[PDB]
Symmetry: C2
Subunit: 310 residues, 2 copies
């Protein structure tokens, strides 16, 4: 029992974090096999960020302009290139601690764990989701660029995110591990902004099921609605349109709670336009949307009674 | 910017988790040096986990009765003994991944990271606070016993918790790494229930300071209070009494924001007697009490 935002154990990722210095700029790098991946703006001074010319800026660099520290072993960069918005640094030493890994591009609404690093030293870990506007709501200070996001499946770490920068609203932007940003963002000093941040309706619903299993059922006192009637209300509070596929995904949770989906949307309808009236749902006053259906079932598994109900 | 419950990186603990099977019962253990620490009810069966006699139960068992696995590597048990509610198994090898470590007994109000494991395989990491009624609001399934709570001070793992029992209300109970339970609980299926919890006043104030650091200033007002006037308001709202040591611990956040601690207590006192009235604090209408002053600092620089 219990329901908590849970991150993946970070050990396999820690063994890959290194510090990367160029000139007077430092940030973090990802050391896999003989390659160190890091955000390309490590080759920049603060004044360069306004209109950097990365190719020209990098042409000026030699292998020995790049300084890579792994714990204390100094690696030797023996090659370098730019791939989209990342540098790939070839090092002499192949990381003995490399895990099985994939480079994947995560989709909005899915979750991942973040290993926040400073000076190449892991400092903390937490769970977040790729937002529909292609930002994430992280916790990053200066020097955190190069920290990575990841999901672990069996013994394989699948890396989805590398951190680059902060938007004025305090949310964060970065790239996949090929160097391609999520969203419209670019690694130069310019006015950029997160779009209309919508709310991952599928996750809110998944979360509402988690509340029922953990004893919260007060909000369930409405009669079934329809998808069109639910979608209509969900328009102005910026909730993504509910779809049949989303309903199918929640089928296991409806079956375990005995609470049909369109019955749970009846409750969500009420919650959105009239609020919570000062109560709480799983200790929260806000509708949580960074738990996927997968996430909620992993923590809320159950038992199937095999009489035949209605 | 940004502010979230974040746990410590768990790799140093992941390298110490092992699997301990004693009959048909499996839970996790902690392998430091040549010793595997694990909850002693691994030796019970369901019939035993009623009212067991451990020293009795233990006498029948011998070394070969303990299957201990670090991954696929089976370890051979070279001895065994009970220390309070833990077993200590002596084994062939000093764990090569034994980090610098120490055992600590945490106090109510403090937080730690939990590495939830199953069959000796780590599966999740999240942040917890020791409640004043000495329980934990964790997330634990069957076979999570032996999972550990820890903090990390640079390269030293401080182990403060090992998981044993789930209580009726769904909150959790366990021991320090010497096997003494936090709180009055026992590793017996007997009637026992968490006492009435209270709110961790020091951590609510830390959280209001984190709010200020992250923009929210509306609740700041203009009065002050002594400790006494504050505590008389707080007692009413089920809050822990605030001591002068608590005030001192809040110095750095007070200095870094410019709000005197007893000024922040006047702000809090008002929020309890008046409510928030449609306004939010870090987006919430409820007062969070599971961040310590240290957790806020570590994250707000």
């Amino acid at each position: 029992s219990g329901f908590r935002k849970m991150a993946f154990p970070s050990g396999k990722v820690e063994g890959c974090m290194v510090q990367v210095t160029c000139g007077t700029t430092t940030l973090n790098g990802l050391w896999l096999d003989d390659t160190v991946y890091c955000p390309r703006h490590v080759i920049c001074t603060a004044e360069d960020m306004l209109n950097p010319n990365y190719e020209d800026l990098l042409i000026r660099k030699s292998n020995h302009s790049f300084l890579v520290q792994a714990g204390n072993v100094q690696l030797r960069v023996i090659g370098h290139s730019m791939q989209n918005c990342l540098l790939r640094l070839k090092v002499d030493t192949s990381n003995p601690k490399t895990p099985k890994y994939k480079f994947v591009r995560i989709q909005p609404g899915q979750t991942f764990s973040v290993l926040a690093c400073y000076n190449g030293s892991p400092s903390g870990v937490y769970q977040c989701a790729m937002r529909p506007n292609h930002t994430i709501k992280g916790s990053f200070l200066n020097g955190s660029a190069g920290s990575v996001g990841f999901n672990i499946d069996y013994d394989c770490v699948s890396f989805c995110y590398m951190h680059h920068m902060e938007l004025p609203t305090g949310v964060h932007a970065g790239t996949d591990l090929e160097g391609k940003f999520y969203g419209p963002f670019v690694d130069r000093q310019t006015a950029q902004a997160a779009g209309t941040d919508t709310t991952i309706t599928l996750n809110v619903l998944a979360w509402l099921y988690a509340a029922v299993i953990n004893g919260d059922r007060w909000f369930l006192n409405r009669f079934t609605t329809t998808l069109n009637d639910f979608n209509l209300v969900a328009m102005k509070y910026n909730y993504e349109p509910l779809t049949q596929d989303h309903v199918d995904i929640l089928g296991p949770l409806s079956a375990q709670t005995g609470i049909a989906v369109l019955d749970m949307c009846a409750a969500l309808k009420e919650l959105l336009q009239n609020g919570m009236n000062g109560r709480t749902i799983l200790g929260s006053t806000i509708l949580e949307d960074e738990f996927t259906p997968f996430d909620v079932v992993r923590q809320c598994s159950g038992v199937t009674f095999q009489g035949k109900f209605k």
